[PDB]
Amino acid sequence: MILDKKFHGILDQGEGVLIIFDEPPVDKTYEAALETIQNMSKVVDSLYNKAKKLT
Amino acid sequence: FLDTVSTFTSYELMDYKTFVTYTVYVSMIALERPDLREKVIKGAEILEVLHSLPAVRQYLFSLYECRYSVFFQSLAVVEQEMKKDWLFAPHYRYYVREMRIHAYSQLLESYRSLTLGYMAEAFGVGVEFIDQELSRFIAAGRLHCKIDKVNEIVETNRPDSKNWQYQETIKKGDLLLNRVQKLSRVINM
Amino acid sequence: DRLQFRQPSLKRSLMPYFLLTQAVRTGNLAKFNQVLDQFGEKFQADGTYTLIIRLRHNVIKTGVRMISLSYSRISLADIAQKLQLDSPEDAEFIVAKAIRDGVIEASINHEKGYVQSKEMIDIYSTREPQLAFHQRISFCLDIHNMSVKAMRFPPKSYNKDL
Amino acid sequence: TDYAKKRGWVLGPNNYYSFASQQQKPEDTTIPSTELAKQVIEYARQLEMIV
Amino acid sequence: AVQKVVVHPLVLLSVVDHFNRIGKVGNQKRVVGVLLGSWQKKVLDVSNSFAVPFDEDDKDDSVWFLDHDYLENMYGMFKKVNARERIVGWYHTGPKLHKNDIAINELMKRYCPNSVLVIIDVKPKDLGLPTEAYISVEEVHDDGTPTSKTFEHVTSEIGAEEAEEVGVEHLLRDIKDTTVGTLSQRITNQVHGLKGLNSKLLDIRSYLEKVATGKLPINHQIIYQLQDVFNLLPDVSLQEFVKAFYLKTNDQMVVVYLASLIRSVVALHNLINNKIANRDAEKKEG
Amino acid sequence: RPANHRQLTFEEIAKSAKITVNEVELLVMKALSVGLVKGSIDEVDKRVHMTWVQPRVLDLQQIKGMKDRLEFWCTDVKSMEMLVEHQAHDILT
Amino acid sequence: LLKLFTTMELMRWSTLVEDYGMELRKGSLESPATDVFGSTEEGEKRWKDLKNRVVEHNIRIMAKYYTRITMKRMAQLLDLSVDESEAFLSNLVVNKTIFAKVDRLAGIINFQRPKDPNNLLNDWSQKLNSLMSLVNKTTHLIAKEEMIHNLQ
């Protein structure tokens, strides 16, 4: 069920320590990464345009 | 392979059962459990074609139930079937390692502190082999954090969530830094 | 190794060196000592055998570094045979020589006669974060700021004549 | 003899004791916050000076 | 009763008129005017007001001069033209609070309802808020001192309704609006330190002096709560706030990424045009 | 002590009030029952945490400490203000 | 009723034993205690559930307090087994004990100290504290500034 990720938790064998944690800022890193990836295409295409207009 | 519903028997290139036998590798290995549940488990295709051979069904059930006992026992058949193929020959080294590291990552996903006993009983293999195995999967594998044997029990940390999610953009950030250094290089010449 | 760059030059240039540079991670002294000199041509034609006579005994340092990246507990038999060196003194001695380098992290402890290590490779995440990425933020912001200057001055060089 | 008057450490029951190891106390975070504020000022300068 | 009040600049500008029509007297003592507003609503609102002659004596401080007839006439005509505003209280331009002010306010405490007292300065050298709203109520004293009129500080804000903003903005053409950005924010981030500096320096000195060197038991008891507030922050080591600093610095990193990326996007058109326009202009020049 | 390791222990309390370690829980329970103290200790290992309290009548050393901490705070705020505004006025204005 | 009102102090029920006993003894007021106890099962159920209700109640009272009263030691001071305490926890799960922090090693329980989100808990606390400090420092300061004018 943890592998199914229906909830937040992790098991243990020897120690038997149960740890529960969550990560609220989900929408931040996603949109940030999307912005980076999208802008990469812009910069690369710009490099293509400059390489075309120069050499 | 989502078009398998409309696919029929073809004597021109490859037979249907051969196509299924070929795609079962990428479907079982390259696709994780959510992908399986979303595609093949929800789909009736594998439900229909599992009656073809008893092997495939066992291979799927053993992996889905995370049982390496029968898996390593039938692993020989999988290895022999993997090789001696036309186009599937050069990749026989890749699928094995990929499946092993995928199984290890899957098992270490829901587990943090693992004792040697339960692990040795689960995999049914010696500790000395998984020793060098995991030891290689640390550096060369690059899956999880450092493992310490001081307690004679496998214990990980894996802070790959919180700070690391924000540290996923540092690589593309450095690449972007080099790329704007390139942009600065185009300047004036 | 070579990944992103595909050209039919560096490949052929690295072909004789590929086997040995791949053999570096393995770290076998005895065999590769003869193997290098066997087919060795160009890198030994570099002259005066300098970086290679350094490399020969650098193999054991990179190897013990791989041990530093490996587990803590050191066997008197198993890993001693794996490293092809068996002796109580030189083991802990060379290990200590790897510790004094400061390139790794280890905790020297003696209780039953066995030497353990904490060997924590864990990053700066959730440990003194500010002082950790401080210089990174400053430097990267400096680069991005001189990049702002780089998007500043050339447009002026465009607008100078118009 | 020499290293005793050189290193100037303590000697126990036939054993060498080591001190001042990772016992260093971190900062109060007040000073680096101030120098970071100064860095913010410098950022204000570099971003807007010529303006 | 009243949580907060609203004071329009018009009355203070009427005080500016009080400093206008003086005509070089050579007396220029405190002048008590009559403030008007709406006591109907919970929040007090000041529209306009008028002025009444007020004189005192050099030696004797108990001398105060008001006018009932002029007040009833002015308020009568003002109520005749506008029924949306009535009497509330009075105000003085004196920087210091005289003891006779309780007797001065007692009149409007009798004839009118409870009055609010406003203290301002004759010379606008004060950087802080010139207007302090003081409600007049009778509170039970803890020390056991006889019940007397006590002035309690009430928070206030300076604002205008509709046209007054336009009039002020037109007459000034100097001051700037909020204008979110670099200079508008950094000006505040600079001068605010002085805003606290001059005030605190003007306060804690006279405080330190009058505490040890002085008498007339003004009930220092509240100042123990003052010092208590000063002790509410026992030099936190920030050790618990480290994670908060990490999150804040993470947000700072987000700002860095956003800035760098956006500026990288803006640099496109510039680092295109700077080439393509110049080369074409140059090749088509001759 | 307004500063310098506010953190304390029940040792001093039990020594001054000559009471055992068993009755200090009921003691602080009564202390929280009155409502003059908001103190709540999050401790695991033996510890005592303290909070806001009323000066009430008077203290001389707390007056000296008042003028001291106040003078220090004031000259610090002044020093930082002048230090920042020094370059801030020139490079920004 | 005063002890059941608010701010209940921890005390032994053995002192209340003879109180309820004499409450059964005297017929001046609240006489039909025997009529209340007329049913053998009902009386025991009501009594046991009363003791359970108050032994839950005081826990709910100290739940607001972060003082960490260490119920492990409290069980020793009350001279009771931990089994019925675990039963009281079985009552606590339907009493909504869902917010808490426990330990595998020791029996120390924590009704506070959560993950502490930087934008929520410490943020709100710093908000209220700093704001109250600022406005309070704003009031009595200038209030005193007005008070020293009475000396002139």
Copy the structure tokens of residue G20: 């309820």
Please give the backbone phi and psi of residue E27, each rounded to the nearest 5 degrees, phi first: -115, -65
Up-side HSE of residue G66: CA atoms within 13 Å toward CB?
14
Report DSSP letters for F42-77, one per residue.
Answer: --SSS-B--------S--SHHHHHHHHHHHHHHHHH
Beta-bridge partners for B154 = B114
Contact E203 G141 (CB under 8 A): yes
Copy the structure tokens of residue G29: 């007021």
List Cα–Cα distances, G44 to C12, G14, G90, in angstroms. Answer: 94, 17, 20
Amino acid at position C67, single letter: I
For chain A, how far is it from start to end, CA to CA, in angstroms?
58
Helix (H, G, I), strand (E, B) or coil at C60: helix
Is residue B29 within 8 Å of B102, Cβ to Cβ? yes
Contact list in D for residue E245 (CB cut-off 8 A) is: 29, 33
Q: At what angle do helices A26-54 and E242-283 cross, to 10 degrees?
A: 20
Burial class (CB in 10 A: 0-12, 13-18, 19+), E108: buried
Q: At what angle do helices F61-91 and E182-212 cross, to 10 degrees?
A: 150
Mutate to test the interface with D, among E190, E192, E237, E240 (most CBs of D within 10 A): E237
Query: Among E208, B188, D5, E169, which Cα is nearest to C156's?
Result: B188
Copy the structure tokens of residue B147: 């493992």
Resolution of the PDB structure in angstroms: 6.8
Q: Is the dihedral of CA E175, E178, E183, E185 positive or negative?
A: positive
Can you tell me the distance from the alpha carbon of E93 to that of E29, in angstroms, rounded to the nearest whole number? 9
Copy the structure tokens of residue E80: 């005749």
Copy the structure tokens of residue D15: 């054993």
In chain E, the residue whose alpha carbon lies closest to the alpha carbon of F78 is E197
Unique residue bearing structure tokens 């009040």: E5
Can you tell me the distance from the alpha carbon of B154 to that of C159, in angstroms, rounded to the nearest whole number? 65
Up-side HSE of residue C57: CA atoms within 13 Å toward CB?
5
Chains C and A make contact, 3+ CB pairs within 8 Å? no
Contact C138 D29 (CB under 8 A): no
Q: Is the dihedral of CA G78, G79, G83, G87 positive or negative?
A: negative
C-alpha angle C71-C73-C75 in degrees, rounded to nearest 5 = 115
Unique residue bearing structure tokens 């009535």: E86
Tally Cβ neighbours within 10 Å of residue F43. 16
Is residue F29 within 8 Å of G10, Cβ to Cβ? yes
Region of residue E32 (left: phi > 0; alpha: psi -120 to 50; beta: else): beta
Q: Which long-range contacts (CB under 8 A, 24 or more apart) does G121-126 make?
A: G122/E240, G122/E241, G122/E244, G123/E244
Is residue E105 within 8 Å of E149, Cβ to Cβ? yes
- Beta strand spans in B102-167 (E): 113-115, 153-155
Residue E245 in contact with partner chain D when CB distance is under 8 A: yes
In terms of residues, how long is chain E? 286
Can you tell me the distance from the alpha carbon of F85 to that of C4, in angstroms, rounded to the nearest whole number? 51
Unique residue bearing structure tokens 């290679």: C52
Burial class (CB in 10 A: 0-12, 13-18, 19+), F48: middle
Query: Among B60, B65, B90, which Cα is nearest to B78's?
Result: B60
Residues 42-71 of G with CB under 8 A from F: 62, 65-69
Can you tell me the distance from the alpha carbon of C9 to that of C12, in angstroms, rounded to the nearest whole number? 5
List Cα–Cα distances, F75 to C92, D29, F79, in angstroms. Answer: 57, 20, 6
Question: Looking at CA atoms only, how far is residue A39 from chain G in angstroms?
Answer: 30
Query: Among F75, A47, C73, which Cα is nearest to B149's?
Result: C73
Contact A18 G104 (CB under 8 A): yes
List Cα–Cα distances, D48 to C103, E103, E257, in angstroms. Answer: 42, 58, 19
Please give the backbone phi and psi of residue E152, each rounded to the nearest 5 degrees, phi first: -105, 135
Copy the structure tokens of residue E157: 């804000």
The two beta strands, E116-119 and E44-46, are unpaired
Beta-bridge partners for E138 = E149
Residue G103 in contact with partner chain A when CB distance is under 8 A: no
The three-state DSSP-derived secondary structure of G104-133 is CCCCCCECCCCCCCCCCHHHHHHHHHHHHH
Can you tell me the distance from the alpha carbon of B169 to that of E202, in angstroms, rounded to the nearest whole number? 51
List Cα–Cα distances, F8 to B185, F3, F49, G70, in angstroms. Answer: 63, 12, 6, 18
Chains B and G make contact, 3+ CB pairs within 8 Å? no
Burial class (CB in 10 A: 0-12, 13-18, 19+), E104: buried
Unique residue bearing structure tokens 């899956």: B143
Query: Among E211, E238, C101, E14, which Cα is nearest to D34's?
Result: E238
Residue E190 in contact with partner chain F when CB distance is under 8 A: yes
List Cα–Cα distances, C117 to C110, C127, E61, F85, in angstroms. Answer: 10, 20, 86, 51
Can you tell me the distance from the alpha carbon of G22 to that of C155, in angstroms, rounded to the nearest whole number? 99
Contact C148 D47 (CB under 8 A): yes
Up-side HSE of residue F64: CA atoms within 13 Å toward CB?
4
In chain A, DSSP finds a helix count (H) and a strand count (E) of 1, 0
| Alpha carbon of residue D44 to chain centroid | 29
Residue C150 in contact with partner chain B when CB distance is under 8 A: yes
- Beta strand spans in E120-180 (E): 132-138, 149-158
Chains B and F make contact, 3+ CB pairs within 8 Å? no
Query: Among B123, B133, B129, which Cα is nearest to B62's?
Result: B123
Query: Among C58, C47, C66, C50, which Cα is nearest to C20's?
Result: C58
- What chains are in contact with A, requiring at least 3 Cβ pairs below 8 Å? B, E, G
Fill in the DSSP letter of residue C102: S
Please give the backbone phi and psi of residue B113, each rounded to the nearest 5 degrees, phi first: -95, 115
Q: Which of A2, A32, A43 sits opposite B169 (nearest CB)?
A: A32
Residue C123 in contact with partner chain B when CB distance is under 8 A: yes
Can you tell me the distance from the alpha carbon of E12 to that of E17, in angstroms, rounded to the nearest whole number? 9
Report DSSP letters for B51-119, one per residue.
Answer: TT-HHHHHHHHHHHTT-HHHHHHSHHHHHHHHSS-TTTSTTHHHHHHHHHHHHHHHHHHSBSEEEHHHH
Can you tell me the distance from the alpha carbon of E210 to that of G125, in angstroms, rounded to the nearest whole number? 35
Is residue B179 within 8 Å of A43, Cβ to Cβ? yes
Please give the backbone phi and psi of residue E80, each rounded to the nearest 5 degrees, phi first: -70, -45
Contact G149 E97 (CB under 8 A): yes
Q: Tell me the technique behind this structure.
A: cryo-EM
Can you tell me the distance from the alpha carbon of E254 to that of G115, in angstroms, rounded to the nearest whole number? 23
G62: Cβ contacts below 8 Å, ≥ 6 apart: F29, G69
Region of residue E219 (left: phi > 0; alpha: psi -120 to 50; beta: else): left
In chain A, the residue whose alpha carbon lies closest to the alpha carbon of G120 is A24
- Beta strand spans in E47-106 (E): 86-92
List Cα–Cα distances, B27 to B20, B40, B49, E64, in angstroms. Answer: 10, 8, 14, 99
Contact F32 G67 (CB under 8 A): yes
Can you tell me the distance from the alpha carbon of E213 to that of E208, in angstroms, rounded to the nearest whole number? 8
Can you tell me the distance from the alpha carbon of B57 to that of B51, in angstroms, rounded to the nearest whole number? 8
| Alpha carbon of residue D48 to chain centroid | 34
Can you tell me the distance from the alpha carbon of E17 to that of D32, in angstroms, rounded to the nearest whole number? 52
